[PDB]
């Protein structure tokens, strides 16, 4: 009873930049999949404690997206909310937020996920307060600014995944290779209709008939390596070029020697797309299962934080992952399943490197280069998709989730699936 369980989860479908859910405010997306996963989790909403959602595009949104999320949903005003800002894990650390909450003694029941509208973030002018007096100014992209910017080396998060290309030495044939091979798997697990079960639809407009939007729109059918190995280079090299210069907060094992080092790699085929989606997870104490008998889908059995140099910040889930198997007392052995988020083909090969992952094992259905990145929500995203895949396998009965963070850092949660 001192342990701690999702109960249930779920995931709205992942809209294109532009695409369906552009005109579904991040609030509308978080209330539809909270709603939905406190009724698949037979939770009365005004038994919920506290809601803690992610979300970081907060810009012009109003008061408290958290608290919006909450209270659309059809949870009480008594029942506070805060929203979470951890940049691209936000959606996880809320998890780690509500299981803290828990074991504090303060909550048995907290609302957890998050929501990330990016095509609605707006643009801003640092000027037109107190005046432009004279000469051109800036229309600041508040989505790359503060989604996807990093703050202290001033360059793109694709410029940071060219790091990582360069000081672990990875090919752009292995980068094109990965995104191959996901969005293949994205595209069976789409026939299979494997996402079904874990999508829930929203309403949206087009022209004048409510329709719903309850399929990934991001996928791309027919990918092969070849195909995508002509693209050019989206983000320029680091400052430092074939030799970045970082401080490590781990020791690194997986580092080769790669010909295309101090080149382009990353492009719109190997990396992460910008998106719009949500998730929802239900998260209770042993103590609210029993007294209200729910059915949990899994225990939550270690959770992890890491930092890491910011130049470098796609390896965060390497001391994450450390932290959380640590806590759940297991190593990547007893590991079943895993959902390490595709932020670059760059950083997913050199995690995967020094976790040792067995890849049979990883992203089963596809990951984010096939299925979208909405910021705020896929470290809630992800966890939803992994847990509906080990419930879908009779075998898996543990499971990895971990995402990379910009800024330096990483989540990660380890789950053991109830019977």
Same mark, same amino acid.
């Given at each position: 009873?001192?342990?701690?369980?999702?109960?249930? #989860? #779920?995931?709205?479908?992942?809209?294109?930049?532009?695409?369906?859910?552009?005109?579904?405010?991040?609030?509308?997306?978080?209330?539809?999949?909270?709603?939905?996963?406190?009724?698949?989790?037979?939770?009365?909403?005004?038994?919920?404690?506290?809601?803690?959602?992610? #979300?970081?595009?907060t810009?012009?949104?109003?008061?408290?997206?958290?608290?919006?999320?909450?209270?659309?949903?059809?949870?009480?005003?008594?029942?506070?909310?805060?929203?979470? +800002?951890?940049?691209?894990?936000?959606?996880?650390?809320?998890?780690?937020?509500?299981?803290?909450?828990?074991?504090? +003694?303060?909550? *048995?029941?907290?609302?957890?996920?998050?929501?990330?509208?990016?095509?609605?973030?707006?643009?801003?002018?640092?000027?037109?307060?107190?005046?432009?007096?004279?000469?051109?100014?800036?229309?600041?992209?508040?989505?790359?600014?503060?989604?996807?910017?990093?703050?202290?080396n001033?360059?793109?998060?694709?410029?940071?995944?060219?790091?990582?290309?360069?000081?672990?030495?990875?090919t752009?044939?292995?980068?094109?290779?990965?995104?191959? /091979?996901?969005?293949?798997?994205?595209?069976?697990?789409?026939? !299979?209709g494997?996402?079904?079960?874990?999508?829930?639809?929203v309403?949206?407009?087009?022209?004048?008939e409510?329709?719903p939007?309850?399929? *990934? &729109?991001?996928?791309?059918?027919?990918?092969?390596? *070849?195909?995508?190995?002509?693209?050019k280079?989206?983000?320029?090299?680091?400052?430092?070029?074939?030799?970045?210069?970082?401080?490590?907060?781990?020791?690194?094992?997986? #580092?080769?020697?790669?010909?295309?080092?101090?080149?382009?790699?990353?492009?719109? /085929?190997?990396?992460?797309?910008?998106?719009?989606?949500?998730?929802?997870?239900?998260?209770?104490? +042993?103590?609210?299962?029993?007294?209200?008998?729910?059915?949990?889908?899994?225990?939550?059995?270690?959770? =992890?934080?890491?930092?890491? *140099?910011?130049?470098?910040? +796609?390896?965060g889930?390497?001391?994450?992952?450390?932290?959380a198997?640590?806590?759940?007392?297991?190593?990547?052995?007893?590991?079943?399943?895993? &959902?390490?988020?595709?932020?670059?083909? !760059? %950083?997913?090969?050199?995690?995967?490197?020094? @976790?040792?992952?067995?890849?049979?094992?990883?992203?089963?259905?596809?990951?984010?280069?096939?299925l =979208?990145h909405?910021?705020? !929500?896929?470290? !809630?995203?992800?966890?939803?998709?992994? @847990?509906?895949?080990? %419930?879908?396998?009779?075998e898996?009965?543990?499971?990895?989730?971990?995402?990379?963070?910009?800024?330096?850092? =990483?989540?990660?949660?380890?789950?053991?699936?109830?019977?």
């Amino acid at each position: 009873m001192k342990d701690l369980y999702v109960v249930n #989860c #779920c995931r709205t479908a992942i809209g294109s930049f532009g695409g369906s859910l552009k005109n579904t405010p991040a609030a509308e997306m978080g209330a539809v999949v909270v709603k939905e996963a406190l009724k698949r989790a037979n939770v009365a909403p005004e038994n919920v404690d506290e809601l803690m959602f992610g #979300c970081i595009l907060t810009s012009a949104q109003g008061q408290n997206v958290a608290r919006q999320v909450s209270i659309k949903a059809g949870i009480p005003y008594s029942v506070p909310a805060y929203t979470v +800002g951890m940049v691209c894990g936000s959606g996880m650390k809320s998890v780690i937020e509500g299981a803290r909450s828990i074991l504090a +003694g303060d909550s *048995d029941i907290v609302v957890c996920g998050g929501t990330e509208n990016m095509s609605a973030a707006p643009f801003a002018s640092m000027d037109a307060r107190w005046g432009a007096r004279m000469g051109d100014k800036k229309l600041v992209d508040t989505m790359i600014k503060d989604g996807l910017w990093d703050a202290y080396n001033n360059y793109h998060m694709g410029t940071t995944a060219e790091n990582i290309n360069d000081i672990w030495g990875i090919t752009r044939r292995e980068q094109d290779e990965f995104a191959a /091979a996901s969005q293949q798997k994205t595209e069976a697990a789409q026939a !299979a209709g494997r996402f079904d079960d874990e999508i829930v639809p929203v309403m949206i407009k087009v022209k004048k008939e409510m329709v719903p939007f309850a399929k *990934d &729109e991001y996928p791309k059918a027919g990918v092969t390596a *070849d195909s995508i190995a002509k693209l050019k280079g989206a983000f320029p090299v680091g400052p430092e070029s074939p030799n970045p210069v970082v401080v490590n907060t781990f020791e690194p094992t997986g #580092c080769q020697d790669a010909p295309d080092k101090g080149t382009q790699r990353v492009t719109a /085929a190997n990396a992460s797309g910008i998106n719009d989606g949500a998730a929802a997870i239900v998260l209770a104490s +042993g103590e609210a299962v029993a007294k209200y008998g729910l059915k949990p889908m899994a225990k939550l059995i270690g959770w =992890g934080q890491g930092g890491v *140099d910011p130049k470098i910040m +796609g390896v965060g889930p390497v001391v994450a992952s450390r932290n959380a198997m640590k806590k759940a007392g297991v190593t990547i052995d007893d590991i079943d399943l895993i &959902e390490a988020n595709e932020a670059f083909a !760059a %950083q997913s090969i050199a995690v995967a490197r020094e @976790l040792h992952f067995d890849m049979s094992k990883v992203n089963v259905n596809g990951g984010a280069i096939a299925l =979208g990145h909405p910021v705020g !929500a896929s470290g !809630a995203r992800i966890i939803v998709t992994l @847990l509906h895949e080990m %419930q879908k396998r009779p075998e898996a009965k543990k499971g990895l989730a971990t995402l990379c963070i910009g800024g330096g850092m =990483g989540t990660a949660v380890v789950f053991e699936k109830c019977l």
